[PDB]
Design a protein around this nucleic acid. Sequence first.
DNA 1: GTCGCCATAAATCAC
DNA 2: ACGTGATTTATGGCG
Lengths: 69, 67
Amino acid sequence: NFSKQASEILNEYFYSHLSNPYPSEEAKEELARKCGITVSQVSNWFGNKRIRYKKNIGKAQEEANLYAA
Amino acid sequence: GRQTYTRYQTLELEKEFHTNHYLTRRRRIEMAHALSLTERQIKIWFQNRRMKLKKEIQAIKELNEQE
DNA sequence: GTCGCCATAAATCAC
DNA sequence: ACGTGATTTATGGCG
């Protein structure tokens, strides 16, 4: 499990890029340095997030409200 | 949907990968018949395994620079 | 026409 | 049991 601040950064990025939740290699490199994690860890998070977030719409909507920045 | 490979199939593929990272058309035919996997499955398995190797070496390279 | 690399989806593992 | 991060099968684009 990642730090509360690393998960915070990742969700803020995801919910503000919902129309195209595919960060470029440079955006993944910048996210990793910010979170203190690896590019492959950022890659796995986005992959898991894109498929899972849409399984519970009500929960996705609550996170969009919460992670709104 | 995706079929998970048996402990025996994985082991045998892993043993051939160590000997050879790339397969010939002939060797791919041999393993397809022996393991009961299509030539397509054997092809994709080796491709994914090569990607796994590139990943693992990078992880170790990251740690070797961190020191 | 074939095969390898790449990023990604989807299922499943491991704790 | 189920959530999370990681890993294992499988696809399509393109050189």
